[PDB]
Amino acid sequence: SIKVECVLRENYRCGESPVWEEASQSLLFVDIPSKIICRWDTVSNQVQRVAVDAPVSSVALRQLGGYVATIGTKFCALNWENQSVFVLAMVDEDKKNNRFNDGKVDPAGRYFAGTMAEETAPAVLERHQGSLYSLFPDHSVKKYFDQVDISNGLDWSLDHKIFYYIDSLSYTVDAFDYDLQTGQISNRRIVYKMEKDEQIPDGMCIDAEGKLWVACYNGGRVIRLDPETGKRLQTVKLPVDKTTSCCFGGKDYSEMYVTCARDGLNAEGLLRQPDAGNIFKITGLGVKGIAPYSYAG
Ligand SMILES: [Ca+2]
């Protein structure tokens, strides 16, 4: 029996980048325009926040300790004890109004993250201004490809030979051959085409059977896809339309956490979606995900 439950009611403006930290039994995430990195201890049920000085679009675990995040167009390191945040590297220095969007750590500890032009409204922005980058463990930055509208959801196959990637405004999930030892990619192809009512593909995670779960922004749902066949396997709807991302968490990665937004909703929309901006948990899916990788620098 699938169960969808609103488990944290903090009314974020745009919750994003959920990441499960098993060591602390906490959910890490960001609220982008609110310029906070959040850590929700699911045991004490208490949320701690680190304020930052620009929109923060993603957060990831740092292997050596603490966290890393994408703030503005900067990869940054966070020490939680002192709330110290410092720049590791900067990208898009020749772009006037870009920011990072979604990011995630690859199986070799590289922090992949892509950028976008800054929006004036959801999906209203200068086109093709972003690029996909990765921050290597030695703190150097690799630039992969440009002409990205809105860099979004991403993950890697379990055999670590394929990289899955969403540019939201292409309305497709794409795949690349990916080399674990070097972090190179190539041979880009479409592996799923979004249907009209699935709206905008946003965040994404892989499950333990190699299927992809995609949060559908404006679509009020997550969908499960088979990248090998190009077919949707499952849909699970939520009572909020602006579902932004998803990850697996809890014991044995058997629960799914879903972030969502209230930004962009009109007065009627807010009333119809009282839990807009909150964190949801989905149980009873019948698959487990995998642990996130930690950044190795
Ligand atoms: Ca996103």
Author numbering: 3 to 299
List sentences from the manuscript.
Senescence marker protein-30 (SMP30) is a 34-kDa protein whose tissue levels in the liver, kidney, and lung decrease with aging. Biochemical studies suggested that SMP30 is a gluconolactonase (GNL, EC 3.1.1.17) and requires a divalent metal ion such as Zn2+ and Mn2+ for its gluconolactonase activity. In the ascorbic acid biosynthesis pathway, the ring structure of d-glucuronate is cleaved to generate l-gulonate, and then a γ-lactone ring, which is a basic structural framework of ascorbic acid, is formed from l-gulonate by SMP30/GNL. The crystal structure showed that human SMP30/GNL adopts a six-bladed β-propeller fold, which is similar to those of squid diisopropyl-fluorophosphatase (DFPase), drug resistance protein 35 (Drp35), and paraoxonase (PON).
In this study, we determined the crystal structures of mouse SMP30/GNL, which catalyzes formation of the γ-lactone-ring of l-gulonate in the ascorbic acid biosynthetic pathway, in substrate-free and substrate/product-analogue complex forms. The crystal structures of mouse and human SMP30/GNL in the substrate-free form were determined at 1.95 Å and 1.50 Å resolutions, respectively. In the course of the crystallographic refinement, a strong electron density was found inside the β-propeller structure in both mouse and human SMP30/GNL. Since Ca2+ was the most abundant metal ion in the purified sample, a Ca2+ ion was placed at the metal site for the crystallographic refinement. The coordination geometry of the divalent metal ion was quite similar to that of human SMP30/GNL. The asymmetric unit of the mouse and human SMP30/GNL contained two SMP30/GNL molecules. However, molecular weight analysis with static light scattering revealed that mouse and human SMP30/GNL exist as a monomer in solution. The overall structure of mouse SMP30/GNL was essentially the same as that of human SMP30/GNL. Least-squares fitting of mouse and human SMP30/GNL with corresponding 297 Cα atoms gave a root-mean-square (rms) deviation of approximately 0.6 Å. Second, mouse SMP30/GNL has a relatively small substrate-binding cavity.
